[PDB]
């Protein structure tokens, strides 16, 4: 089980991110329209998981906008994964015009425990930590970042080099 | 998993239809000549999946005739998907002169499980529930309908509006 900071104060996740080279855990998430978004849908393609506390937080929202702009440019598949309700993700994407990213919600699924990423303690317990996971066409993890501090933006450049690779 | 009615009576499907905006589950199906239809062959254009119990049931047969009539005018791609053996679909289309739809059998493929439309229980266990999926040119799901009651026809207009790019 891992460790990050929220405003310089130490907090814990419930596990660890999947190891590079190993099989990315299977997932079934909830789409904006309450449909499913299964890992099986991305098999044989690369996908980046942009994992964060909430679209309704500022660094998280910025990451959605930045990945939407950058994906737009390249046809990259980016999944924006959080504990938001589907309705919040959808409302955000619709308010902002952010239409390359696919929002997906972990509100009724095991994603957060499975990816080691649920915050275990402090003010944000139950949300997902800020992390990036690149899953290759192969289904195995190509690259990961656990952002050290929650108020820090993800490393977009390293995540997307991994993804294009 | 999802739930529908058959003549008012609650029935379950094996899973859930994919969220609009997410990658359409890949498939292979069997065409009237016992060849392979693959989801790949449609990439670049919108395709509408008209999914139903059987050509040899009336509402289902009506949906095929109605999509044929409409797709013939616009030249839209409509695939008629069921657990019927290929020979029934082919016979139906030939008896009825419905030459604009493409029939496709899941009788030896995982379509129904993958799209979550296979009925779990009752008299109709193992048949595909009545549903529409429109896959855009990009291969993402553009539109879904799980018809609430099996005895009811699908919403042609809303499906066809999504199919028109």
How is this fold's topology laid out?
The structure is a homodimer of 165-residue chains.
Chain A: E1 3-6, E2 9-12, E3 28-30, E4 36-38, E5 47-51, H1 58-74, E6 78-82, H2 86-96, E7 102-105, H3 111-114, E8 131-135, E9 141-146, H4 156-164
Catalytic activity (chains A, B): a hydroperoxide + [thioredoxin]-dithiol = an alcohol + [thioredoxin]-disulfide + H2O
Subunit structure (chains A, B): Homodimer.
Disulfide bonds (chains A, B): 60-93
Tell me the Rg of chain A in angstroms. 14 Å
CATH top level assignment of chain A: Alpha Beta
Main interface: chain pair and counts = A-B, 18 and 16 residues
What name goes with the CATH superfamily of chain A? Glutaredoxin
Q: N-to-C terminal Cα separation of chain A, in Å? A: 29 Å
Class based on secondary structure composition and strand pairing of chain A:
alpha/beta
- Assign the CATH architecture of chain A: 3-Layer(aba) Sandwich
- Major sheet of chain A: order of its strands? 7-6-5-8-9
β-strand percent of chain A reads 15-25%
* CATH overall fold name of chain A: Glutaredoxin
Q: What coarse outline of chain A follows from CA principal-axis ratios?
A: globular
Oligomer: homodimer
- Please write the string of helix (H) and strand (E) elements of chain A: EEEEEHEHEHEEH
Biggest sheet character of chain A: 5 strands, mixed
Query: Count of DSSP helices of chain A?
Result: 4
State the total count of DSSP E strands of chain A: 9
């Amino acid at each position: 089980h891992s460790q990050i900071t929220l405003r310089g104060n130490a907090i814990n996740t419930v596990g660890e991110l999947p190891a590079v080279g190993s099989p990315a855990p299977a997932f079934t998430l909830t789409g904006g329209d309450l449909g499913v978004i299964s890992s099986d849908q991305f098999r044989g393609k690369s996908v980046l998981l942009n994992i964060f506390p909430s679209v309704d937080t500022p660094v998280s929202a910025t990451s959605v906008r930045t990945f939407d702009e950058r994906a737009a440019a390249s046809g990259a598949t980016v999944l924006c994964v959080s504990k938001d309700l589907p309705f919040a993700q959808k409302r955000f994407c619709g308010a902002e015009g952010t239409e390359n990213v696919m929002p997906a919600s972990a509100f009724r699924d095991s994603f957060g425990e499975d990816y080691g990423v649920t915050i275990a303690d402090g003010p944000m317990a139950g949300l997902l930590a800020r992390a990036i996971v690149v899953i290759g066409a192969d289904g195995n993890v190509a690259y990961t970042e656990l952002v050290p501090e929650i108020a820090q933006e993800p490393n977009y450049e390293a995540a997307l080099a991994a993804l294009g690779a």
